[PDB]
Structure formats: structure tokens, C-alpha cells
Design a protein around this ligand. Structure first.
Ligand SMILES: C[C@@H](Oc1ccc(-c2ccccc2)cc1)C(=O)O
Ligand SMILES: *[C@@H]1O[C@H](CO)[C@@H](O)[C@H](O)[C@H]1NC(C)=O
Length: 341
């Protein structure tokens, strides 16, 4: 069980003005800290956010959050469930800003909602320093879905924050799960993110912002465009046939046009990962994420994700028998026998 702490700076808030927070389970024998960002889409205008507040309120408010949560998958403390980092200090940061972790805008007389995702991450880090993070050797910022995109948008800012505060010995790294999307043609979305960024006052990493310039910062929400600009080490996990990608593409007895569309999607995704040295990309149709209890089961070329992450740790101290770049080459969902069912 991870225990809830509401932020002591109550001006860093969820959408409705309630305090943001984090769930924490300490492991005093360990200098490793895992900070995990939850996902859950986003909202992009007043009417769209009002609908989310009626039926997805936990993603917009802390008023109903439970006192504890159970750590599962990469957040589990059991060696059998988490061969990678079972002994680490574990932090789960709830997603309550509806902004893909990009916002820095407060509620006011002109704003019905606050969009503070980028500030929430920074304040969690600041408050954890006095709970043991000051002694850390590695801080892994991880996340799934919209939280995986959030890792790409925030990992370098966390690294910069810790350097400026006087903690140069903490190695900051990122793990982005299911947050690597293509701005492709539909079979039968970029406008919504463009409007969202304006509504949130959303911020993107500095080098990427300077490449794309004003009006075009939406480009930095796409992993293949923002990843090359990042200085921190980042491991990318992405299904070749991600269900959320196919949903935005309007894909639901497959004839030739759809077969070619799906094969081309997998080939494009593979191509974008060619120069990503730490990656795990199985040829599966799935929405499953790294906090599920059976995350150990899938393998690419005979290597599981917990093993690849361990090999990544070793590389940051090629390795014989310990690979870090694992991308399937086969061209159709479930051509990998270990895909989830
Ligand atoms: C479905 C699932 O994942 C994602 C949803 C949206 C995004 C995303 C990507 C690029 C630009 C803006 C938003 C990424 C992942 C979830 O969050 O429930
Ligand atoms: C609380 O957070 C807000 C927004 O980030 C910031 O302006 C303010 O300085 C913070 N307060 C303290 C005491 O750090």
C-alpha cells in the first residue's frame, strides 16, 4: 500500500482547485526512487471539460481520493511481480490536470479550471526531497498513456530543477509507456491538441520549443519529434499496434485496404524507433500498461521488459546476452506469441 499525501503548497491544484497530491511507500534501504505519472486522455475546452467533470471527476479533483492505493506491476514491492525494482521507493502521482502533464495555469476570475500538470510534478519532487529523495542515486520518472507522453514533456525539466536546487548527484531518467503516437492519416486529433495547448497555457521542453517555434509547439507532443531533443536517458515502451492509436485512426474479415493500412502503421512505428537505443516494442494489438500485475509475461526476441530495463540500468553504469533495443520485425498483430490476451 502507498499512502496519500496532499501537497503542502495548496496553490498547486487539480482542475477544480482542490489540492493535488501523491501516494508514497518508502524503502529506507534503497537509493532508487520511482515516480509514476497516471494517464487518462485530456480535455480541451469549457464544454468538453464540464462533461469530464460529471463522469470522470477523480481525473479532475482530489475530493474523493482514497487514503491508500495498491502498488502493482513496476510499482509492486514483491520480487515475483517486479523483478526490476521491487526494493525501490515507490511514488504514484494521480493525474488530475487533464492537460497531458503540460499545464501551468491557475484557476481565476477568467479561468473556470486550473491546468497545472507541469507544476504538480515540480512540487511533488520538491516536497519529496525532505522525505528522503535528497539521498537518492537514481530518480526514474515513469508513466503510462497520457502519463507516458508526460514523461517526455517533463523529464528534462526535473533534471534541471534538481541541478538548480543543489542536488547534482541524482541521476534523472525517464520511462515512457504507451505515450508514443503518430500524427498519421486516419483510415476513415491534432486540432484538439492545438486547442488544448492554448486553453491550458501548456509548456513543452525548451530545445523542442525552439525548433518548432510559436504556434507549432503541438509538434512536441509526438514522441518521434520531441525524443531527439532530450538530454536525459529515456526508455520507450510502445505496442506496434496500440489500441488508442487505432481508435484515433478510426479502426475497429479484414480486406486489402485495411490490411495495408495496419501493416503500414507497424512499419512506420518501427521506423521511428530505429534510433531509440533503449526501447521495447512488441507486435501486439493492446491497451495494456506496465502497472498491470502480469507485465512480466511479454517477451521480444526472448527477452522480457523487466530484463531489458535491468540491462538498461547496467548500460548506464553493448552487453553480452543483455539487450536494450528490442523491436519486433513481424508485420501483423499477435505474430509475437507472447502478446497479451
Ligand atoms: C488512451 C491513453 O493514452 C493516451 C492518450 C492521449 C495521448 C496523447 C498523445 C499525444 C498528444 C496528446 C495526447 C497519449 C496517450 C490514455 O491516456 O488513457
Ligand atoms: C506554491 O506554488 C506556487 C505555484 O507554483 C508558487 O507561486 C508559490 O511560490 C509556492 N509557495 C511556496 C511557499 O513555495
Amino acid at each position: 500500500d502507498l499512502r496519500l499525501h496532499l501537497l503542502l503548497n495548496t496553490s498547486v491544484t487539480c482542475n477544480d482547485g482542490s489540492p493535488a497530491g501523491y501516494y508514497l511507500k518508502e524503502s529506507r534501504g534503497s537509493r532508487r526512487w520511482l515516480l509514476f505519472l497516471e494517464g487518462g486522455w485530456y480535455c480541451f475546452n469549457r464544454e468538453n471539460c464540464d462533461s469530464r467533470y460529471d463522469t470522470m471527476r477523480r481525473l479532475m479533483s482530489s475530493r474523493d481520493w482514497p487514503r491508500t492505493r495498491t502498488g502493482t506491476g513496476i510499482l509492486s514491492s514483491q520480487p515475483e511481480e517486479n523483478p526490476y525494482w521491487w526494493n525501490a521507493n515507490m511514488v504514484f502521482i494521480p493525474y488530475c490536470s487533464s492537460d497531458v502533464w503540460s499545464g501551468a495555469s491557475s484557476k481565476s476570475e477568467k479561468n473556470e479550471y486550473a491546468f497545472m500538470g507541469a507544476l504538480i510534478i515540480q512540487e511533488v519532487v520538491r516536497e519529496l526531497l525532505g522525505r528522503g529523495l535528497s539521498g537518492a542515486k537514481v530518480l526514474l520518472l515513469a508513466g503510462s498513456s497520457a502519463g507516458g507522453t508526460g514523461v517526455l514533456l517533463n523529464v528534462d525539466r526535473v533534471a534541471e530543477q534538481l541541478e538548480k536546487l543543489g542536488y547534482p548527484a541524482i541521476q534523472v531518467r525517464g520511462l515512457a509507456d504507451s505515450g508514443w503516437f503518430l500524427d498519421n492519416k486516419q483510415y476513415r486529433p491534432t486540432e484538439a491538441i492545438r486547442r488544448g495547448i492554448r486553453y491550458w497555457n501548456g509548456v513543452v521542453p525548451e530545445r523542442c520549443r525552439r525548433q518548432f517555434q510559436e504556434g507549432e509547439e503541438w509538434n512536441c507532443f509526438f514522441g518521434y519529434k520531441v525524443y531527439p531533443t532530450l538530454r536525459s536517458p529515456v526508455f520507450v515502451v510502445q505496442w506496434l499496434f496500440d489500441e488508442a492509436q487505432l481508435t484515433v485512426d478510426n479502426v475497429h474479415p479484414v480486406q486489402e485496404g485495411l490490411r495495408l493500412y495496419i501493416q503500414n502503421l507497424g512499419r512506420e512505428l518501427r521506423h521511428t524507433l530505429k534510433d531509440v537505443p533503449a526501447s521495447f516494442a512488441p507486435a501486439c494489438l493492446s491497451h495494456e500498461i506496465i502497472i498491470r500485475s502480469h507485465w512480466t509475461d511479454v517477451q521480444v526476441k526472448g527477452t522480457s521488459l523487466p530484463r531489458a530495463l535491468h540491462c538498461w540500468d547496467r548500460s548506464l553504469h553493448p552487453l553480452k546476452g543483455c539487450p536494450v533495443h528490442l523491436v519486433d520485425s513481424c508485420p501483423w498483430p499477435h505474430c509475437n506469441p507472447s502478446c497479451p490476451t
